[PDB]
């Protein structure tokens, strides 16, 4: 019984993906991508909407699997507000980093998913009573996955893991 935010996000990603299949990636990127020219500087939604675009089935399929389980866990035990904050801040800062690496043409919940990984893990390690935790097995796929990216690029994974670890560390200061 996943919460609202978890559901809305999932629906939002499927709606955009379908829109992309009907209109074409490039066409949807013109409206949803990170500002690609000074004139779009104030299209404030762009700093977040890039996370709603995916370029294949596995891409959105894998991202939505992690989101539903990690975001669901977070929303159930920590509330919708917490999930919204983690999402917004991870989408923004992860988009910001990716941008300087490969330019404005990118998309996906990768950065957001990693923040959830980094948040749910450190959070469960520092504040067990939070009711959240990332299986030490899953934390291995994650890191194995990032390293695999640096070879076989998406600096969104790194900037995302950072925001999550940071926020978690911060929400865990009041030890228990």
């Amino acid at each position: 019984r996943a919460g609202p935010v978890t559901w809305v996000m999932m629906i939002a990603c499927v709606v955009v993906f379908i829109a992309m299949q009907i209109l074409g990636d490039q066409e949807v990127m013109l409206w949803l991508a990170w500002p690609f020219d000074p004139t779009l500087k104030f299209e404030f939604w762009r700093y977040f909407t890039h996370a709603l675009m995916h370029f294949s089935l596995m891409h959105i399929l894998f991202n939505l699997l992690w989101w539903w389980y990690l975001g669901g866990a977070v929303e159930k035990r920590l509330g919708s507000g917490k999930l919204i904050v983690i999402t917004l801040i991870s989408a923004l800062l992860s988009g910001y980093v990716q941008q300087k690496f490969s330019g404005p043409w990118f998309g996906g919940l990768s950065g957001v998913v990693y923040a959830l990984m980094g948040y749910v893990w450190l959070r469960g390690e520092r504040d067990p009573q939070s009711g959240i935790y990332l299986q030490r097995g899953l934390i291995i796929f994650a890191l194995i996955w990032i390293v695999a990216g640096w070879f076989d690029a998406n600096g969104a994974h790194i900037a995302g893991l950072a925001v999550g670890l940071a926020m978690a560390f911060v929400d865990s200061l009041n030890a228990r």
Side-chain angles (χ1 to χ4, degrees), residues 2-153 155-176:
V5 180
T6 299
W7 268 103
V8 170
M9 174 56 87
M10 291 186 56
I11 298 180
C13 284
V14 176
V15 169
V16 171
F17 183 70
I18 296 177
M20 286 170 82
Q21 313 313 293
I22 293 170
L23 288 153
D25 296 278
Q26 328 74 237
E27 183 57 61
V28 175
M29 286 163 83
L30 286 174
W31 304 304
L32 301 184
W34 186 277
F36 50 88
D37 179 278
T39 62
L40 308 171
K41 206 173 181 180
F42 297 81
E43 313 234 307
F44 77 78
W45 63 82
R46 286 176 182 279
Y47 304 91
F48 309 86
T49 54
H50 49 81
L52 306 174
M53 301 186 276
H54 303 89
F55 312 84
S56 61
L57 217 49
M58 294 307 98
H59 185 211
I60 184 187
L61 183 63
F62 287 156
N63 284 350
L64 292 188
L65 296 172
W66 286 96
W67 162 270
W68 167 275
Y69 290 117
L70 297 181
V74 173
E75 181 159 38
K76 176 191 176 175
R77 287 303 176 196
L78 303 181
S80 298
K82 182 60 59 171
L83 181 61
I84 286 169
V85 182
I86 293 169
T87 305
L88 290 182
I89 300 173
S90 59
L92 175 60
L93 303 183
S94 66
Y96 180 74
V97 166
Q98 183 59 46
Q99 193 285 317
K100 298 183 171 182
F101 283 9
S102 57
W105 308 118
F106 60 77
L109 272 187
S110 315
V112 179
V113 155
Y114 265 78
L116 281 173
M117 299 179 137
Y119 187 91
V120 175
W121 173 67
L122 187 57
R123 180 57 159 158
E125 288 284 47
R126 300 255 302 174
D127 180 32
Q129 289 177 50
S130 64
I132 257 178
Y133 119 90
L134 184 74
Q135 306 196 295
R136 196 91 202 203
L138 310 187
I139 199 180
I140 292 305
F141 293 66
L143 296 188
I144 289 184
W145 182 211
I146 294 185
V147 168
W150 301 338
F151 289 62
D152 319 306
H157 300 174
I158 262 299
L161 197 76
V163 179
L165 297 176
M167 292 199 80
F169 177 93
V170 178
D171 294 340
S172 283
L173 290 177
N174 301 312
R176 289 177 186 169

